[model samples]
Target: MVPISPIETVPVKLKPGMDGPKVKQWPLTEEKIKALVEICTEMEKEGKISKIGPENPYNTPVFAIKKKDSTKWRKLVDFRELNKRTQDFWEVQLGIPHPAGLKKKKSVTVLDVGDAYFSVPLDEDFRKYTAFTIPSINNETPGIRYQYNVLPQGWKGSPAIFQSSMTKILEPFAAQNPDIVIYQYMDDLYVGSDLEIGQHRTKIEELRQHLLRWGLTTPDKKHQKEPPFLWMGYELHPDKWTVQPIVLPEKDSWTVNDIQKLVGKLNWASQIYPGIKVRQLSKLLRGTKALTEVIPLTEEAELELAENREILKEPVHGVYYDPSKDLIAEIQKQGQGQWTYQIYQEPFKNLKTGKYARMRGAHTNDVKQLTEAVQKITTESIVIWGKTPKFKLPIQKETWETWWTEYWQATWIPEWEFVNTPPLVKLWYQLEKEPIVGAETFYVDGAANRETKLGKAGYVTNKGRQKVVPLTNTTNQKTELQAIYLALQDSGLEVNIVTDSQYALGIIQAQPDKSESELVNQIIEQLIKKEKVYLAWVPAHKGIGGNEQVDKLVSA
Candidate 1:
């Protein structure tokens, strides 16, 4: 919640090919460094030395240290070791499934927060305690110099702390104002609703005021306006939200670094983009030659790019740079090594000082962790029937088609048995002559009028003694199955199930089997070995006695 001060009103512009430290030479000359040192010395002389020495254990090339009269600098604990010891609290997450069915109306609004860069003033006092140097103290320099490092402005731990702070600021207002739904991914804040213009406006304004109070500011161009706003390359229409590919003004003439910077932001919007199959945007960006170099595109390259265009109109590719050996070694040695979910706990430490003091939890390098967390949250939430909002795109169609393609599929549970009709006949027969006295009839008719009206025609007669009691018109195939299931609730009977359709049988016997045929085999095995449910198959629509009886009741 700390507001950046001495704000630069103008947008910070970088010169092409002019990469180095951020400090401008003229303003921060050697004379200035000397004068700053003098000021520190004078401050110490008067015993007005409020500033302490650096306590950072692993000092980075970018850090500064103060010299103090002490035999040894503070013994710092290796953060990696500390991280290993500390248990991760945000490990368990839920995966909530979106409700299915074409007409099952539900609203989804995804609130994505942009990584608002912060310009933090050096915490001189806090820095001294964390990063003091023994060598400097032994030499007895008047004071320590302020150092700068070009680490990421938005880092790993930054997001969590920033998010918590932002949440605290807005929680009260959010509680009082129930209309707006707020979701956070680090500094990004997404709020949405299905309410009309007036309500949306009020909620947005209220949120804006709260963010302003918490030292957060929205880009004027992307701030609250209408229900939908194009922030971070997303066409966030109140009715529907979608990601629009960033048409970089200099994209065609860009270099690897330019693309690298933009790719981080673009991947974030990919969820809303839909069907973006690029494994890594940065890799693609790096592959392309710089515009100035003007290397001829090979035929193969052209064809590949053309193919990419067919899918991704904006073909952005970036490079993959390998990490240093030391970094790789540490990552590999960690419990959740390199690619594991828990690597986020040991987020890249400052190499020299071994501190993650400036690390923010918003790094795309932690994308794996964030994605896993989101998925986990979604999975667990779905199991328990929790609500989540999603953003969607709109189409101008007379009638909309269902999202039945692989795009709508979830990878967590790839194999599933979908029954157009349940196998009620099997359960019914199992109950027919059970030792328990409460034997009832079963129905197996599709819920169509043609099937319902032809009632009792499909009834089964016990060969000439008595007809299997007709399962009533109220019992459609699924209902009948449920009813049979209800009847067998406590009936101490050996549940021998039988079904004609492979689909139905699969449902009767759930998972771990290789195929539908294997499922039947397993059921047979269970009948013999475990003495559990027995599986039997009846030929469909045939005049077989059992089939005929079931058919009559179904028609009935």
Candidate 2:
């Protein structure tokens, strides 16, 4: 085993919003305490951690989190308070290449560098801020505090520093050996070859020797030869050019934390299964409350969860197929107007040409135009692979009218007027502004829950006139946008639209993704055409009557 060494220190800048150091405590069982002590002692012996002296200015509490399906406990320090104050630097991302590149490979080898973060050393001065306390064994003495000498797991800058160092260390070796392709993500290294198994074995040996020479350690137990699947949270089936998430058995109940983990895994898997329903599921869980809160799963939520799990079980096609190349070649052979094309959530073999084109998520406007272009080509039939395609159309006047009459008639609006404009333009204008006639105050808010993947948006005037609409496949951000979009329909009057989300405001100020981006762009276009709307940001749950009223309506 090669010895570990420290990477150089990088500065962290904290946010001005943070007040001071935040501290919290969790109860530990005797077994957990004993386990913690043993790990700490071993790390101390290896010069990875040390006792903190009285001279330290900052201290944060630490706790142990039990590893899933294992007795092992990992120590975690709450750096949230500290993290809030720190500036985030650019970090190197290690990504899995397209499986098409490995199609010719006969075998694969996986290697893991154990305790990767701990292997990188922390700066001597910076270590003082990472100090945390452990309860005394006797329960009579004061808690003991220790600081990390090595790069701590919870530190914001650790990953970037480690990635930079590791990449630099391996570049020469990677450049020298072209036959074997190597990819690294933090501690995990995947080395692959398109040659024979013997050649693959030889390449692995060369990598092992090179890593050892460079003072990097690889754990023997983690080194696997010809593994059935490459496990990276999700299993990668290189032979099939597909990836599927590793689904464990479900528990009877779930906490907000559990939902968070599921959402995170799904977000990562989105790269493989683009435009999947899991993206809708992500919106539901995005801005939930406390992590430990018990999530109340409704029948609709349970159904969505089951559907998502089934989706994960099936292998998603595409990750390697190049659609542009196939499209270009076809266009060259038969001329641009001769062939038609259709994109899907996955790749499938073209029945006419015997070629496959991989389709995933692209810009909404771009997808629409592509579909239209293909429709115009009458010479060839368009084929969509994998699942049925779905699109989210803009809100229609009839749909809004139906919702207004059924749900909001009682409490929201006394009367609304039908505006004679394009469907994509303003839907309707409020006729009676009598309740808050003098003050043009429009309170807008959005609500979302993980269990149902449902979001709602509501806007109310002080005069008791209001509008509430339920959103499908939406998150808090989209709902916020909806609130703003609704508020903008009234062209002549100057209205103060108050919302709790700054993200929505930012999107309005700077429309990032061009191509007539959804709600934000529409709102901007309206502003340019009308120029009589103002937006104000208000802190949530402060007991402001208008703000609280809309909050209740949306949450309900």
Candidate 3:
């Protein structure tokens, strides 16, 4: 066991010339006030908090929030003001172990430590900054202020500090215990083994003794006794060789908080359940800004939630394989052009049909061919990797939902404007006079080099507008597609797109089976619903006025 002493004080290094703010107290109800007093009394009794002097420089207000499905209030200090002044120069990588590894184990035990953050003592110098005032319980004293003597719940650095300490203590034990796989996610400790019941129980007992010796306590109720399954928000059914989510929201009725919670659960489960679409859901939350309010859900979000629920209903079935040792048969391209990568268990296995039992397609532009192949062999899950030049895989269901929903919703409004006829536009002269009256003309060009790539598109309507877009990588086809896409979005009614690249014109018109054509597909979908939209290919560097202007602008 590690003999490190409890951290009695932590230094709060503030940014240069910044002082911690003293926030005023917020109004609270009598019931909430009573709860705060009780909490403070208990924390003081545990020696985890202490009354502060009147000369303290920093003082933040306190608030209370109830736990989900419960009325019991938990005291929370508003550390937003203090956090701004404090400098965080430390970082710790914390994550739960992949549940897939537990599949080989016959039984698993989970031990959750009680009062996790309170165990770490706070630095005396930093305690003043965590100070907050509460209504006094005694009639004689109206108000009293107290600061946390130990790490507080809402401190910015509390989690990293606690994790750092716990990691040090567990390092030795983890090194010695080779038979039992010990994994920690802050407060939760998972011990898994494929050994007999007695053997596994002995390991758990040893771990419990080890924790106790280090002054850490795990409540009796928190210790699972050779459980059939472990529920870490997501269920890890080792017996069934599957992982699944514990809760899912109802269609169209979930708030932002509900969607966020569901996404977080799915993200953790993604380590085991390969098809859960963790990245897509996480991207959705970014748009919501992690709000807890009742933000509306789009039809696409509902559909995605439903699809994810269905996928979770049945567990992903397969055994794990070592990618280093396993031999890949061949990356066979199907008749429809989709890739089929097969992994063989043995060196000279029959390649015809003796591949692994689990198989899935690497759909067109849905996932990287290489990433899909590797994940398929090792995790038995198909994963999309890398953002593309002009496209991203599995175009966000939420985006599509919002577009269609908002379009229809706006159409039903009484004062909505409809494009009854195409607006008049000034035509640009070329080799031949094309009869394109009242058509918005968009001239687009793409430029690329070894270091950087750019696409520029300009619309010749209502005082011409042009925009230059920087790209991560460049391909003539990709840049041309971006220009056409911009033209589609800018022109709501009749429009004429003039581009120098025939490849760009061919893709929008033919919609062929080529890489990065996902944007073309999206444009085609919009074009089908649009009116009088035309794509015209112009000869490059042929003294065409409109094309020359686009070329000049793009080059500039």
Candidate 4:
């Protein structure tokens, strides 16, 4: 394709708030310097960029990053400083289309634009703020300045800006010939036809010629028209699609970088179950600092990673979201205090495969979140649901507290079109009408040293108070939960426990997720095994005699 630019462009401009010294370029090694020079040389020769004199007011740093493939280096304008101050803009994204109207056989081709953002040239006046300084190899020479005459790679709205131009060029072509499926998502064009090579060849060549005039080159290899094809990161087929194959590292020990890579890979593999239980793995990075820091594989993380691999092995593909089918949600406690939920789409032709149209669900321990999951999993399809210990339903018309209490005491609400779980069992506690005269109150407290990052737990009940016990690896919040657990574990049969932590009390009323510390489960376990467990919350530092006494004993 011959080079010819034709399109209106959006000029680069920073937000009104940005005013500071130019961003200094970061240090680079000899190899990085060579790569930068080579990139600059090629862009200059291709008339994609030009050198600027020292008088330019705007300047940002230029740096190199290893490309995703890791085979070569990439030069970036470090536009982070600019993007933080850049004006906010909207992006254009295409939702996954229901592949419709074609009978059994369908052929598809993908057309990718070469250097998509760079294809749209920038105005000379707009090039001022895109300036960058390339540092010299030695202290003897001064650094040279350069600016992008075209849109730079790291600019915030490059995708949206570039996608708009492509849309304008493709719109008229789409209006004239509406028979073939012509879909554009960002830089890639999807072309599909029912007949093999009949009008497919002609349509592709016609679009190619149209692109040539606008200077967007589509290489021959990027025009993927065969079956075992990859489109939008999925192995696309006529009837189905599968996630790309992946193999994880077998070694037990992993650094932050290794977990990060695993998260990225799982993100791709987990896309198979669109709205289902794709457990988030980024929580693995919580409390972790540097990428070089080695992380010990905890039991919880190990179990999640193993399940994620099993998820990767499932037969993942797309099915048309049939509005005629029923959608149902199931929620229950998997015990050991764990609760999980699943959504099943009512079966159509699975076209082998719900009420067994199982969409994998999330592992969570909150009732409200499980109810919220119902809201998300329901789309244009009809949702029929049934369960007990009624939560605030997603579609409930009454006020949350009003309807929640209304539904809680009733055995059935027959207005909706679904069966209900027989309300024979009460979900929460039933205290005795007559108070036990011998029950004594206990006050528990937790203390932590900010500098030392260690803590202690203390309790006072009938002077039957235990001396403070030191806790290893502590945070302010950590010890509160521990203190409550310690008090429950050590107390006599007739003890009434009170703590300053509503959160310690909160977890028992609202169950903690499986991912939380075992301390919560331990505290709840103590309550479940006991006949006389009376727990309540008291505000912190209220000068109550028992609470203040316990607090001083636990203090650093």
Best by TM-score: 4
| Each prediction's whole-model lDDT (CA) | 0.34, 0.57, 0.57, 0.61
Q: Candidate 3 lDDT, tens digit per residue, 73-142?
A: 8988888888788777467553334333333567667888755557777776777778888865443564
| Selected candidate, larger TM-score, 2 vs 3 | 3
**By descending lDDT, how would the candidates be arranged?**
4, 3, 2, 1
What are the per-residue Cα lDDT tens digits for candidate 1 across 134-186? 12333445335333111122222233334444556668877987755665544
Window of ten residues with lowest summed lDDT in model 3? 383-392
Encode model 2's per-residue lDDT on 1-556: one tens digit a residue: 5453434555544555643354654556666667778878887898888877656656777777877998878777788766665557686564434343233344567888654556667666556667777766655665666888776777777777777767766788889988776777657787777777777777777877777764666776646544556444434554444445446348787778887777666555543443223433444565777879776676756765776676577656443333333321111111111112222223353211211122332222222222233333222222222122222123344744544454322422212233342323122222222232344778888887767769898789765668889988888777887887776674245566778888875554332222234676676555555434566777888898788988999888
Please give, for residues 130-185, the per-residue lDDT of candidate 4 as tens digits.
Answer: 78877788645767778887777777767677777778888878777776677776
Worst 10 residues of 1 by lDDT: 328-337
Give each model a TM-score. Answer: 0.31, 0.47, 0.52, 0.54
Full-model lDDT, candidate 1? 0.34
Candidate 3 TM-score to native: 0.52
What shift in Å separates residue 1 of candidate 1 from its native position after superposition? Answer: 17
**Which candidate, 1 or 4, has the higher TM-score?**
4
Clashing pairs in 4: 277-360, 277-361, 354-357
Runs of candidate 3 exceeding 4 Å displacement: 1-12, 27-31, 64-73, 89-97, 101-103, 136-142, 220-233, 239-315, 318-556
